[model samples]
Target chain A: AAPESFDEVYKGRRIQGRPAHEHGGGYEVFVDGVQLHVMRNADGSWISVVSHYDPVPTPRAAARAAVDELQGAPLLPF
Target chain B: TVRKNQATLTADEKRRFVAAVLELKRSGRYDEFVRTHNEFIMSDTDSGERTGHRSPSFLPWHRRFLLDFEQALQSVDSSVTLPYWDWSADRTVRASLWAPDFLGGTGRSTDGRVMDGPFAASTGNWPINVRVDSRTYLRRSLGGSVAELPTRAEVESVLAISAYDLPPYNSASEGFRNHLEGWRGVNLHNRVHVWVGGQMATGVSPNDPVFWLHHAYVDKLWAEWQRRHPDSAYVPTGGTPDVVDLNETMKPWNTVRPADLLDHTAYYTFDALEHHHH
Candidate 1:
């Protein structure tokens, strides 16, 4: 099952990962509350219109992992 | 009997090693290793269910892969074992490891035709079974694309990073896994691919024997990382989909999970992994 939206401060960054309607990826990412949709392509790649890892299967899950990896830093505020 | 120290390999050992490798190629198994690696390399991207190359699992993943291949070689010739190439020590093409009698030397600039080494098309010991480029035979112009191999200091800089994976758990992260994986930050995975030149430098790069050794060293680096940071472990604990969580089993081999792979001692120990930050 795809994950639902989440809001939390990780390593000091306010992050969010939500569900997306894209074909492959199942999620979107928001760092410092700035939405950056993670993507997944048919070939199992993630590329957004400009960046990728978009429509990440579980945007929230991916975002959370990202935050955890961040240690303790605020998002770039985008 | 397995390792001959890169400094000195009796002509007989060289001949035996070459013959065994060629035998695998003749039997159609050698190239299969190349194809398997390419499939994982291409598929294991950060886009979706990250498996092979792009994720923090990169180092452990390849560690298991080379072990599987090494076991295969042992099956073929009981006395045979995998030897690592210290690219940093053998920095130049003149190193004995690249001697025509041993592993071949660098390739030409125009089309990357290997002028020396056993794998040279002239020697006929090596064959470019799976390749993307038109030229036959595997090629490598090491230290040409990149100035130098990561020195002790440089490698330590990466090992010192205590985190296990990057955020988002994809190719771009700064944990020991990603650093040793060499895909994101300084281009570890990608650089080696490019260093091989010819079809290997491109997407279709399973054709070279050095691919195994290169990955072996990469695997060795992982062993080193584990030693430095005994506390820091594999990341992505659980509840993640399409990716291998710490305890969950990785696909294509669900029987063994990342947990099984975490302690390489279950399989083999490195000759000696340099310690950092200790």
Candidate 2:
């Protein structure tokens, strides 16, 4: 099942996630309006291009991780 | 050519390797490698048409990628060969692998920007141009994301798995490839990236010079596994969907197949590989 869509301010940046309808990625994540590529592992953990290796438990957590790792820098599209 | 452990490198070898890397960056050849890696990482998926990572071909794909990078380095300096960092041993930030004369140390806590070493942004020679965020600086927080690197016992356990890969042949599979790739079991390769905790942990990891050395060791482990299990070989001989069969060609270099790369000695040799004879 797809995760419920979410949108909220994270660390002062607007973060959002919704069903991607892509081939394998279950959701599309965005930070401050820029798309952040996030993928789901077989084990159900989430990982983003900004934090590609560290798998978080949810898409929201993945977005929050991007915010924390970005440290106020703009999240550039890959 | 012989790829030695990073710990074994002399001051001269370090200088030559760093010089060649900087030269590649100056010539704009290095950033493209970063771009290429980011593309594949973003594109590769457990369910989709996967290559470069997250599939049975992960080992061979990276082998070809490293070979291409090594060739570029050799073009600059024939004496410069990629060194392997056995993270199982050199597991701390203070290890010689992090010395400023080489790949540099961990980053400042505030922004994780590396303030020392040749690749430091301050050097103006190494800029994090191909990146996920606006910060164009090489950064690291060794042992920050993860407490420690995988121990030798953990690595040995993963290597002991006889099958190269199994059915489904993806991250969800149970075999040497998935375990060594760190999707299951004790988690070897992926954990080291998390331990580094910067651009090294991201899709564009090649931006950090350590990416090559890290993969070199992973490649060595693959060689070691082949020695330990002489009868075991790459699996899903044919008819596996969305997975690269042993004879199928890997992308970005479609001409080369996994079968072509099964033997590392054909291209290069390691300085000292522990022989594990049953």
Candidate 3:
């Protein structure tokens, strides 16, 4: 299974998710067309570089948190 | 250059350090450093070509970053050097390091704004310019967000790890790098940031002047680790993908490589560092 993909328009920006196998395997998220790297832990929690200090349970939650951290600021390219 | 403990700085030393830092802020150089750090923090990850954080290069990357910061401080006041804060020893908000004269104490409960010290917003000297949040005031909640800082015993356990880093390095790896970086094990560096709260917990951690002090101590730990395990060095010696090998050049400063920064004695020495025999 490639895991499930996710996409949404968060805070007026187009955020998309797809199958990613980088960083011990996870998902690649795009915020307003820029990449925000995210990964899943062995414990089933998810974390993103923008919110690296905190972990959320799902990729959507992680993506939402990245949007929250971005707070209208454009995410710098990874 | 010799980095000393923040607690050991005399009144004069403290004055000089404070002056240099404020000067950097005034010249608009300080906030740029904060912005750079946040950019790299946002970019570097397990999936991409990681550099500043979450890799074996974490130590060396920070070494160079601090070197630049120290040089800037020196340009302002040649006598001032970056000081380390060994939070394990100075664990309380009551420590002199947090006094109004130094980096300031915990933020007030209203909005976590620092209510005292030279960098406090009320002083009108330090402003939180490069930040993700709108409130442009120095903030900290020492021992507020997190209950406690890592104890000496916990730090020792991390130091005791023989390998520099392990296979599949990043946040998932199990080795000295990730352990000390606090992605794994008992949590070292990250816990300190979380404990500090405010901007310290964010990607733009350098917004808080204490970020330098915190990282200086972390850099000191890397020095201590090198001395403790002289035979054991950085892993993935060369030609690794994504992760920076010992000889590979790090980003933003493609001119220098990790091999160039492995030794601390070349640039600066610690005022006091003990090599644990365990």
Q: TM-score: which candidate is best?
A: 2
Instruction: List candidate 3 segments past 4 Å from native.
Output: A1-44, A47-51, A59-78, B275-278
Would you list the C-alpha lDDT of every candidate in the order shown? 0.61, 0.90, 0.84
What TM-score against the true fold does each predicted structure earn? 0.72, 0.98, 0.85
Interface RMSD of each: 15.6, 2.9, 5.8
Could you tell me the lDDT of residue B87 within candidate 3? 93
Q: What is the lDDT of residue B265 in candidate 2?
A: 91
Report the C-alpha displacement of residue B258, candidate 3, in angstroms: 0.8
**What's model 3's overall lDDT?**
0.84
The runs of at least 3 residues in candidate 1 whose Cα sits more than 4 Å from the true structure, single-residue gaps closed, are: A1-78, B1-13, B274-277
> What are the per-residue Cα lDDT tens digits for candidate 3 across A1-78?
445788889888788888872244456778877877776654467777655666678888878887765546676554
Docking class of 3: incorrect
Most accurate candidate by lDDT:
2
TM-score, second chain, candidate 1: 0.88
